[PDB]
Design a binder for this molecule. Structure first.
Ligand code: SF4
Ligand code: SF4
Ligand code: FCO
Ligand code: FCO
Ligand code: SF3
Ligand code: SF3
Ligand code: F3S
Ligand code: F3S
Ligand SMILES: [Cl-]
Ligand SMILES: [Cl-]
Ligand SMILES: [Cl-]
Ligand SMILES: [Cl-]
Ligand SMILES: [Mg+2]
Ligand SMILES: [Mg+2]
Ligand code: NI
Ligand code: NI
Lengths: 263, 581, 581, 263
């Protein structure tokens, strides 16, 4: 039976979201690609380049018009007429608009596509802009994080394929399943927070006992993600578990909320 | 049209122009243009970075302690290496020395990245340039088993396995949804593997795609997550507790056991899957030992990496040697000094930036990142480029030089430097490898050689992972647990004005971050990154960078199909987000 | 010395007495004694459970809702099965119906156990009876590879792999530290595998030891941990949330994806490693199709298991059939009723327990667990048993009978019941399997047969795991998420007095828990467990249980080395902590 | 290079501690057995039975007198002159005492060997007695839990081998590394406890959001173990994460501290 077409494009990005996706432990990214979706366009992985890649793009968005999921990694820059990000000699934004027009739904992978991420931090030299400020007539599912959790990315895909539906979202377009609660609402160091048991300097006695990282700048109290429950890399760890406070990396504007080490 | 001579090449932009935009199976955005003569030989090559974000501008005014987190996001492929260079640079500026275990753990983080990145590059990025995936459908499963077993002890080699892999590919393509294989170059005459070697390589593609996810569990233990683990100025935040109450909240014996398990599996996969596959590509593609030499027989550069003596970045400490060769004189490995203003300089006469004088280069402590999108007299227009004008500004990538010389960086460069400095392990590895291929040492200076050296380096890094792990455990056995120095954590303890350099060898080559701190804040933060070197545009002398040189003089079987261009570019493992930052 | 006749056997305790104490490669504590005649053939066999804990006594006065946690600790090998029987029994007594997803998940829990338990038994417990581990050191690695590839598509078959395994074994034994292989039966003439088959088998032993750990991740997801997962009266505690806020706190899509991944890998391992290995053991040990028949051609018993219609324990619901055959009449599979006082009864005339009348059997609702260590004259002392006195009390295991008949339970029993009830999948599987061995159907009624049936059950259960998972996902797609019924959670809702039966088919055979509740507490809790049946001592008529019968008439090559005894006992997969509780 | 000899005996038990040990993910139990220790006696796994197994036992404890680790699973019953647990026709306690006499150190695996576990719960029909009440002249490391976590068991072995010392212990003989803190001190649902956000009946809305299990009888506040941090079965889950309160299974006498569903 045919697999659901997916077109995966890249704007200004670091490719962390693609890298996260291929970490997926269950389903393996191999099995996602071979059996769950048809990953029909993806600059990072596809054989074809140049004119052959353009032909793929055009053929897929035409033949599957109205029927493909568009995944977006990165974002369009509005500065310099868009030519801070060039694809096939033209502004990336033109490719984004063409792809968006034919999509049934759009997944904004990562804080880049969702909000802006590091290139949109002050003073935003390129006028990097999140997808939903450019594409205003299509469903956009925001999957933020820098990058999002690998098994969250693949669970979202499996949900869409298995249940033949978009995930229900909060008021910001994030899937409720993984972004309904805060890091700090499911953090295993909460006992320490509640008792006023804090790391005060790196590698102090508190740190060696896994005390709370709030006084070291942890932004888990204002960050919605699944890191303290699902965790990272097949459940091996997450930022706090390995001794660094949450940076807030799933939240809009987290780069410009002050030092990561301050309150 | 024009013609001029540089570095032994005749740069001639007469004749047919070919454009490859987008370059795929790389990180980020690149455009390549060439001219070819009537003999289908490239006579001109143009390397263009087609993205820019401006991290060096974004870092101004930030707290130096936060810098690592920002610059880590230069790149999610080489994830972590920019954080390491950042903490190095800030520690160098302020005068901070980290505890031994922090240094060992950082060395583990870097070796982990080398293993992971090199593995994924070999299979997922470059592999399909060498392996004809659709030709695997024609292989005989038993002959595939016999081939694999003749090359390796690796267990997964049964005829039944190869049949199952083949049937999976058969099913994949049976509905006409070829996905990443659609409209590929399959059947091109430059595909030289027999069907059985294609099936073996494709099975390994799949095994590598699965296995790579495991490697980065080491990053998750020490750094919280991959991609983009966490770090600190002063060491690492992964406090250790082996034998005291609350070890459940720290790096403890169970966490270290997990690390050891991953190291052993990583070594095994690299040694018994990646290595034999690299040699097999060599055996079937020997002509590519004479294609794509570029600058690799003239000028190569390594800063060196993996300081084994904590906080000592000298030659006696770095386990991966540094040095520079110019003018093809491999008898003279020259020392590199990243503070010397006459050594590393970047030019922008052919890039989209403003300088007060674009005819000179600027050392990074005098660096300027003032973006200026000015493609000038293109064929087409500024928002619809049909042909870049390489006589003027044609890239978001700055042009680094070393004492005015255009250099190649990366695994081949490092291999040459270490070989010619007399590193015993490197000499033995290279000699054994080239002996097995019946090729001269010069055969490494090539597109094929870049792939061979990358595989070598993955095996090297896997062995170093065990070495570093053992050193960490030795310290813990001796009661040496410290992972952070915090006596200069607070800004009031810093010099009012200071500057520092953080350097290392990323997967793709020499990386440096130059930072100036004033009044507690980043005053300047300039990055020169390995793909900035290799993908460099030209300089005021017209000197070409490593990609443009390696593409020069290349034969193309079919002009409309850029297989040979992709092979050579992919052999350098381009990271365009890195290159431009 | 005496002789008497029972069940077609001549029980004769003349001749040399042999003692095997401890029986190893079982769970828990067993002693076996035999007498052999001048032809070294067993003419008497004595099964003795050498442990007791008294869970039936400990359970008195407990809250019914807590019972499952206590009785789960009857056994950590068949972990979970007693919890399941407990929640079934308490629900039966109170009148609780669980939601469909709870039932499905319970069935997943049980199938997972079947897969795990049967795999570990095949390799780690029974395997070394059939595989000469030391003889593997003589194998040719290429011939080993050839053998493996002839039998299976399993990937891990390279000559190098087998050489690496062999070399690991060589280094292990070289220093004299043979560990679990110390003082084994290696070289015994009944070891019939060629060296290449021994090396293949040993390799798979190691692979299975590694892989079994993964199977129980399914228990970890739904049940918290393995061993000894958690359960509730009224369903399961693993609340489901797929598409709502807080799914991170529940069984969500990522958790279900993990389960699916484990199911697929579990099926692949069992189908491509365990199944071919069991067939190979059959091919090289065909005479064991005629050894250890015991009661399997006379009397076999299944209660049935895996209700597919939630809260329906009838014949149309149970996916694993129940029934009883007696007197060798497999044309009349009889219905089993666990409430009928004339059906299941336990005797203690030959066990260390007190009844007011030890000449009668007690149904479990009339059960008594009053320990009485009374070995009589044992040629030593009460604290030094040199020879059990099988004419009197000789075991901590009670003697269950069904309508006064001594029965065999377990995989072979179940296979025979389902085969003779006309289950299509079973008939086709058994016929094909015996066809492949070129043996008659009767060859299944044997020590070899028990092993073959157990392997085939692991395959059946891995198939059912996927069916159950798909049934769960179907409900979730339809918005049916419920996992607990709590209408009758509070004791104020319960009958003042009620009783119930919980039953299932554990990996080793028919399991029942009989519970009587009064005034909110357990008044009576009696267990009859599969190994209680099989390892049973004699009854007032002198009838022998499954183990004693299967050992009767068995030739021993070397009396002092009880390899044949071990083979037959291990084929039943003894769990002595289960048997005694 | 010779591996440290280990003798593993079994008293009254359910074999959950052996089963846990073989679940070890890192190091694999395979590698523990082949490379880290010499598991020289172990009823559950060893080839030899009966007189052959007696010979192994006698030879190992004689040849390696003073130099082997004794692992004990289960416990000795004092009732019926010890004949509630019989080995080679004699009370198990005799084999315990013989093995203990030659050991350099003893590991008491699980709640059984440490405290008593289920057979010692009221009314303790067999007079099941923990190892440290019988053996009083040897180092005993208590590793409680029913069973203990697989990777905790292997971590303790690796520590003893690698560091050539016993783990430091609390006042009850439990390794500080894994038993120094309570379940509730590192529980990811502590946020809910602090907020008075509790499951009140199974599969209620609170349960489906992962609220705290205190009102459902969770004994995490008085239980010392690593389950909420190291977790179970290669980090996949632990009791509370899958929706059941902690039973208290690492604590002495936990079976008799009231219903698992009461306070
Ligand atoms: S570490 Fe961060 S998220 Fe966790 S309890 Fe402390 S402040 Fe909250
Ligand atoms: S679930 Fe148990 S351990 Fe966790 S916070 Fe609640 S009471 Fe404490
Ligand atoms: N390797 C790597 Fe990325 C590049 N170029 C960096 O630094
Ligand atoms: N299987 C199993 Fe255990 C036994 N006998 C139970 O029930
Ligand atoms: Fe994930 S491409 Fe990496 S920077 Fe933050 S999401 Fe973007
Ligand atoms: Fe672990 S053998 Fe199982 S009962 Fe509680 S520990 Fe005992
Ligand atoms: S930094 Fe990001 S990865 Fe998770 S713990 Fe915080 S949202
Ligand atoms: S029941 Fe036991 S397994 Fe851990 S969570 Fe509680 S100590
Ligand atoms: Cl794109
Ligand atoms: Cl942002
Ligand atoms: Cl023992
Ligand atoms: Cl206890
Ligand atoms: Mg720069
Ligand atoms: Mg009973
Ligand atoms: Ni990069
Ligand atoms: Ni059992």
């Amino acid at each position: 039976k045919p697999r659901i077409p997916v077109v995966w494009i890249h704007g200004l990005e670091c490719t962390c979201c693609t890298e996260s996706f291929i970490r997926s432990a269950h389903p393996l990214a191999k099995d996602v690609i071979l059996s769950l979706i048809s990953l029909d366009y993806d600059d990072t992985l596809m054989a074809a380049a140049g004119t052959q890649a353009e032909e793929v793009f055009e053929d897929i968005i035409t033949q599957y018009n109205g029927k493909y999921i568009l995944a977006v990694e990165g974002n369009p820059p509005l500065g310099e007429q868009g030519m801070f990000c060039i694809s096939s000699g033209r502004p990336f934004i033109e490719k984004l608009k063409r792809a968006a027009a034919g999509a049934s739904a759009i997944i904004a992978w990562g804080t880049c596509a969702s909000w802006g991420c590091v290139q949109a931090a002050r003073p935003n030299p390129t006028q990097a802009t999140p997808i939903d400020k450019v594409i205003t007539d299509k469903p956009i599912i925001k999957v933020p994080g820098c990058p999002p959790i690998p098994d969250v990315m693949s669970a979202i895909i499996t949900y869409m394929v298995t249940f033949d539906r978009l995930p229900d979202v909060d008021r910001m377009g994030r899937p409720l399943m993984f972004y309904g609660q805060r890091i700090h609402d499911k953090c295993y160091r909460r006992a320490h927070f509640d008792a006023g048991e804090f790391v005060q300097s790196w590698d102090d006695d508190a740190a060696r006992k896994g005390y709370c990282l709030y006084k070291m700048g942890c932004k888990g109290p204002t960050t919605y993600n699944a890191c303290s429950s699902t965790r990272w890399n097949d459940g091996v760890s997450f930022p706090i578990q390995s001794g660094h406070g949450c940076l807030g990396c799933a939240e809009n504007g987290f780069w410009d909320r002050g030092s990561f080490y301050s309150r | 049209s024009t013609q001029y001579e540089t570095q032994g090449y005749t740069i001639n932009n007469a004749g047919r122009r070919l454009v490859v935009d987008p370059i795929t199976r790389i990180e980020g955005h690149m455009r390549c243009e060439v001219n070819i003569n009537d003999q289908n030989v490239i006579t001109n090559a143009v390397s263009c970075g087609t993205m820019f974000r401006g991290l060096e501008i974004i870092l101004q005014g930030r707290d130096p302690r936060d810098a690592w987190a920002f610059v880590e996001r230069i790149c999610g492929v080489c994830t972590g290496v920019h954080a390491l260079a950042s903490v190095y640079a800030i520690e160098d500026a302020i005068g901070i020395k980290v505890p031994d275990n922090a240094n060992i753990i950082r060395n583990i983080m870097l070796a982990t990245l080398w293993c992971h990145d090199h593995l994924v590059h070999f299979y997922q990025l470059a592999g399909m340039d060498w392996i004809d995936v659709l030709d695997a459908l024609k292989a005989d499963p038993r002959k595939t088993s016999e081939l694999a077993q003749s090359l390796s002890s690796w267990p997964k080699s049964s005829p039944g396995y190869f049949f199952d892999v083949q049937n999976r590919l058969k099913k994949f393509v049976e509905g006409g949804q070829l996905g990443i294989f659609r409209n590929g170059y399959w059947g091109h005459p430059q595909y030289k593997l027999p069907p059985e070697a294609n099936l073996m390589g494709f099975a390994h593609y799949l095994e590598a795609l699965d296995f790579q996810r495991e490697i980065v569990k080491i990053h998750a233990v020490f750094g919280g997550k991959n991609p983009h683990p966490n770090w600190i100025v002063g060491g690492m935040p992964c406090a250790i507790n082996i034998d005291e109450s609350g070890a459940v909240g720290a790096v403890n014996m169970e966490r270290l056991n997990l690390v050891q398990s991953i190291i052993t599996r990583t070594a095994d996969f690299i040694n018994n899957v990646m290595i034999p596959d690299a040699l097999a590509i060599g055996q079937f593609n020997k002509p590519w030992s004479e294609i794509g030499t570029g600058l690799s027989d003239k000028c190569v550069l390594s800063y060196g990496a993996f300081p084994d003596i904590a906080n000592d970045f000298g030659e006696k400490s770095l386990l991966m040697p540094g040095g520079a060769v110019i003018n093809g004189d491999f008898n003279n490995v020259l020392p590199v000094d990243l503070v010397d203003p006459q050594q590393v300089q970047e030019f922008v006469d052919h890039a989209w930036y403003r300088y007060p004088n674009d005819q000179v280069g600027r050392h990074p402590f005098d660096g300027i990142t003032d973006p200026w999108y000015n493609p000038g007299d293109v064929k087409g227009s500024d928002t619809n480029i049909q042909q870049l004008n390489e006589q003027e500004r044609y890239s978001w990538i700055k042009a680094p030089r070393w004492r005015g010389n255009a250099m190649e960086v990366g695994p081949l460069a490092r291999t040459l430097i270490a070989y010619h400095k007399g590193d015993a392990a490197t000499v033995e590895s290279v000699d054994r490898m080239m002996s097995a291929l019946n090729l001269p040492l010069s055969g490494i200076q090539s597109t094929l050689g870049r792939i061979l050296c990358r595989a070598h380096e993955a095996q090297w890094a896997a062995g170093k992972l065990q070495y570093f792990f053992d050193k960490l455990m030795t310290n813990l056995k001796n009661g040496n647990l410290a992972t952070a120095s915090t006596e200069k954590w607070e800004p009031a303890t810093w010099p009012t004005e200071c500057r520092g350099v953080g350097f290392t060898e990323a997967p793709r080559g020499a990386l440096g971050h130059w930072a100036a701190i004033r009044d507690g804040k980043i005053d300047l933060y300039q990055c020169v990154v390995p793909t900035t070197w290799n993908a460099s545009p030209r300089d005021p002398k017209g000197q070409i960078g490593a990609y443009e040189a390696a593409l020069m003089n290349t034969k193309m079987a079919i002009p409309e199909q850029p297989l040979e261009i992709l092979r050579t570019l992919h052999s350098f493992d381009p990271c365009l987000a890195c290159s431009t930052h």
